[PDB]
Design a protein around this ligand. Structure first.
Ligand SMILES: C=C1[C@@H](O)[C@@H]2O[C@]3(CC[C@H](/C=C/[C@@H](C)[C@@H]4CC(C)=C[C@@]5(O[C@H](C[C@@](C)(O)C(=O)O)CC[C@H]5O)O4)O3)CC[C@H]2O[C@@H]1[C@@H](O)C[C@H](C)[C@H]1O[C@@]2(CCCCO2)CC[C@H]1C
Ligand SMILES: [Mn+2]
Ligand SMILES: [Mn+2]
Lengths: 581, 288
């Protein structure tokens, strides 16, 4: 090749005029070797053609070209960047196609108005009116940057081509035009939004292909924001109402998905007239996907009803459908509802929440699907901040205390997870007065798995409340078990000390737990004695070296003399891991 | 070797059999250990007593979730580790492996199924063939079973065996006199200890099993008084509630295979004897 440019080429592999990747990124520098003139005359030309799909390379080339205006001569010459960009737009792997368009959109603003017409638009058309399809699925993304700046006359052409792109024979060129109809709409004067955009919108909304229709819902949000409220009923709502009624559940799904957005774009009045009933239909769609999407929007929707008619529509139009959903068959739906249903408390007030929501709050807190009761448990903050901690405690607690004690240990195990959540949510003062007891009681449960769960649970509670809280609210009651006549409980004591050293710090572990551990080295049962060796091994690293030498080493050494085989074994292992051997 | 045992146990806990080679080793040492033990093996509390497990491996894992893990919790199994269940190999091998690794944390008694004839009628033999490729693993295990203690006495008060009482055995000394190192005979004291069932008819009755005998409350009372026993703890019989008291509480049956044969819909139980011999029962459904 030729050396100023040949540095880009990769002479070592066995490709087809391929380039050095970690060199295309070092592109803005070869552009300085040859200067502006030579960058335009030989670097860009060389990059235009010579395009071997090394993809990761094609990508960097398209990105880099978007920040090359100045390396080419500044504004007056930005159009020299089009040729290779037009190229990369029509590639295949879409990632590259996108970077090409993003860049094309970036340098569009560098083009002067006069240069947009002479070079940019012509590129939009060639892409729009291109043969291949990709050349069209990317054209759609370039109309809104050049429309505002060109002549009234070229704007017209730009309108026609975008239209032609909407009624393109290929669906993809239609889906793409649909997903960009919104932004193009925001840059046309109003008259043309009413006379040209609306028809394209109507057309796309009634597309044979539903993959095109469900996209029109998004476009509707955009067009509806641009139109004065009075024009909405005639030019838009019929179409939107039809979409919520669409044969394809996908189109309907998109309506529930973009509901809150439609609500704002449309206005309080139409939301009261048209959207409230639609929302009700959607919450009763036969497809569980659609019901679930709608349910998910319940709080957001009610929040945006005009404060004026708000409370009366919720109590009359929304709430009944909600009572229904709480009992829906699909857990997909109950799932979506529970992750927001209590968010309606600050919108109905203490009294309303207490009489109408709390009952649904319980219906789900005792539901099949664990995700459902978990979604309710994960969002107590809002209801708690509306009704009192006592009004809540009085309606939640009995549910909990009723599950902490139960049939299968499996269900009891489930209630233990709610703990760190309840703690971090309802507060530490509430946890110490109503929950602490329950967490202590499980340590001494009949089923080992429960004890175990309750034990690791202590670590997670300390992470919530801190080492000080632990030294005054949990360590004492946990150490009390060291004197239990049953070895299962005595061992539980060490198991709690093991987990709590992971988070109580050197101080609290050395002063307040280590002694109890060292003290049990003389337990009458061997299982406690060897778990004592295992415990020192575990909490050992947390202790400073002085303590390990004067207080642990001696105990382990004694235990290695023990009558029992296993205490000996574990004592030796302890000494070896800690290096006191 | 210890690092090894630990690995085998980690493997078996995933329900993955050991190899023929390893089984042959597990068993040669297991015998070394079991030969030293007595026909009336001395066990001190605390201990958790379990009944039949019959190769229901996943229910055994459920048992450990309820009673704690070995060697932290001390265990006493009253036999019947194989047959009926779908995993006789993984189950008996894990237990024999826990014994070799922890002689003092686990006691394994012999049940009516830890024998050569019955395992060829109810599973063990065939499962072994279908999992190794010849009868060797089964010869290794059935030879080991000859060494399993027929009985355990906890704190000199609670007497544990698989089946029940024999008309030709009145004292713990009578049992200690038997030669247990041999296959289970079709008749006699040793057979009876592994086959008999407590009954609600007095005296000795004809067993519906075809081996051993049924014995009533009066016989339990006499045997308990004569031997300074507070209780006879056995298994061998399916008990819907997992465990069952009888003979005015001189006898308790503990069955640890929930939903036996995956057909009976019984609960399982395990019995905890604390540091003081105070007892308590844990009932459980099959693992999900
Ligand atoms: C095993 C047994 C006995 O225990 C069993 O006792 C009886 C009374 C109680 C018992 C049933 C208990 C039920 C809860 C289970 C539940 C289910 C779902 C199935 C089933 O399962 C039983 C076998 C087993 C293993 O599952 C068990 O539960 O016992 C067989 C009957 C099945 O309905 O009943 O049935 C009468 C039939 C009898 O049948 C065989 C018996 O013939 C075996 C025979 C006496 C033995 O003779 C020898 C030689 C002489 C000395 C002894 O050794 C060689 C080995 C073997 C041939
Ligand atoms: Mn039996
Ligand atoms: Mn049995």
């Amino acid at each position: 090749s030729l050396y100023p440019i040949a540095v880009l080429i990769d002479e070592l592999r066995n490709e087809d005029v391929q380039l050095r990747l970690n060199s295309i990124k070092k592109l803005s520098t070869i552009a300085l070797a040859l200067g502006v003139e030579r960058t335009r005359s030989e670097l860009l030309p060389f990059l235009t053609d010579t395009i071997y799909d090394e993809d990761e390379v094609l990508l960097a080339l398209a990105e880099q070209l978007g920040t090359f205006t100045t390396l080419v001569g500044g504004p007056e010459y930005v159009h020299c960047l089009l040729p290779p960009l037009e190229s990369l737009a029509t590639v295949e792997e879409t990632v590259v196609r996108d970077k090409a368009v993003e860049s094309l959109r970036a340098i569009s603003h560098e083009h002067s108005p006069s240069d947009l017409e002479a070079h940019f638009v012509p590129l939009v058309k060639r892409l729009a009116g291109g043969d291949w399809f990709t050349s069209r699925t990317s054209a759609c993304g370039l109309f809104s940057v050049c429309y505002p700046r060109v002549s009234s006359a070229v704007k017209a052409e730009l309108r026609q081509y975008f239209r032609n792109l909407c009624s393109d024979d290929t669906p993809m060129v239609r889906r793409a035009a649909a997903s960009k109809l919104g932004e193009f709409a925001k840059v046309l004067e109003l008259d043309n939004v009413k006379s040209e955009i609306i028809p394209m919108f109507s057309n796309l909304a009634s597309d044979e292909q539903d993959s095109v229709r469900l996209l029109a819902v998004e476009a509707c949000v955009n067009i509806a924001q641009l139109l004065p409220q009075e024009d909405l009923e005639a030019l838009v709502m019929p179409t939107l109402r039809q979409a919520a009624e669409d044969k394809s559940w996908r189109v309907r799904y998109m309506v529930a998905d973009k509901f809150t957005e439609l609500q704002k774009a449309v206005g309080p009045e139409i939301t009261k007239t048209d959207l409230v009933p639609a929302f009700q239909n959607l919450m009763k769609d036969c497809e569980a996907e659609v019901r679930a999407a709608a349910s998910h929007k319940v709080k957001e929707f009610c929040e945006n009803l005009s404060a004026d008619c708000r409370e009366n529509v919720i109590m009359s139009q929304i709430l009944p459908c909600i009572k229904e959903l709480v009992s829906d068959a699909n857990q997909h739906v109950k799932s979506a509802l529970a992750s927001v249903i209590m968010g309606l408390s600050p919108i109905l007030g203490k009294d309303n929440t207490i009489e109408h929501l709390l009952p649904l709050f319980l219906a789900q807190l005792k539901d099949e699907c664990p995700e459902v009761r978990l979604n309710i448990i994960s969002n107590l903050d809002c209801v708690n901040e509306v009704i009192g901690i006592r009004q809540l405690s009085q309606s939640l607690l009995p549910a909990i205390v009723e599950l902490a004690e139960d049939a299968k240990w499996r269900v009891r195990l489930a209630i233990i997870e709610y703990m760190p959540l309840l703690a971090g949510q309802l507060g530490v003062e509430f946890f110490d007065e109503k929950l602490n007891s329950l967490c202590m009681a499980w340590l001494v449960d009949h089923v080992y798995a429960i004890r175990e769960a309750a034990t690791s649970n202590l670590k997670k509670l300390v992470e919530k409340f801190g080492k000080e809280w632990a030294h005054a609210t949990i360590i004492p009651k946990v150490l009390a078990m060291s004197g239990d006549p049953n070895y299962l409980h005595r061992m539980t004591t060490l198991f709690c000390i093991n987990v709590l050293s992971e988070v109580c710090g050197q101080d609290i572990t050395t002063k307040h737990m280590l002694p109890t551990v060292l003290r049990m080295a003389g337990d009458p049962v061997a299982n406690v004695r060897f778990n004592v060796a295992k415990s020192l091994q575990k909490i050992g690293p947390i202790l400073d070296n002085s303590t390990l030498q004067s207080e642990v080493k001696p105990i382990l050494e004694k235990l290695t003399q023990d009558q029992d085989v296993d205490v000996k074994y574990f004592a030796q292992e302890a000494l070896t891991v800690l290096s006191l051997a | 070797f210890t690092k090894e045992l630990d690995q085998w146990i980690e493997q078996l806990n995933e329900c993955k059999q050991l190899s023929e080679s390893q089984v042959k080793s597990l068993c040669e040492k297991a015998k070394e250990i079991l030969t030293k033990e007595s026909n009336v093996q001395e066990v001190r509390c605390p201990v958790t007593v379990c009944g039949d497990v019959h190769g229901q491996f996943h229910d055994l894992m459920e048992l450990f979730r309820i009673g704690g893990k070995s060697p932290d919790t001390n265990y006493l199994f009253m036999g019947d580790y194989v047959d009926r269940g779908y995993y006789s190999v993984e189950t008996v091998t894990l237990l024999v492996a826990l014994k070799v690794r922890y002689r003092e944390r686990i006691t394994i008694l012999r049940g009516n199924h830890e024998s050569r004839q019955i395992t060829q009628v109810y599973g063990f033999y065939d499962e072994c063939l279908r999992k190794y490729g010849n009868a060797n693993v089964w010869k290794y295990f059935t030879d080991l079973f000859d060494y399993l203690p027929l009985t355990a006495l906890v704190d000199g008060q609670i007497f544990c065996l698989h089946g029940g009482l024999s008309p030709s055995i009145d004292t713990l000394d009578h049992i200690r006199a038997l030669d247990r190192l041999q296959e289970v005979p079709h008749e006699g004291p040793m057979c009876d200890l592994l086959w008999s069932d407590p009954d609600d008819r007095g005296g000795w009755g004809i067993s519906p099993r075809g081996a051993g005998y049924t014995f009533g409350q009066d016989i339990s009372e006499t045997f308990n008084h004569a031997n300074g026993l507070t209780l006879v703890s056995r298994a061998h019989q399916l008990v819907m509630e997992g465990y069952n008291w009888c003979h005015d509480r001189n006898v308790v049956t503990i069955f640890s295979a929930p939903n036996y044969c995956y057909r009976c819909g019984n609960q399982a139980a395990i019995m905890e004897l604390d540091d003081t011999l105070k007892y308590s029962f844990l009932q459980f459904d099959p693992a999900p």
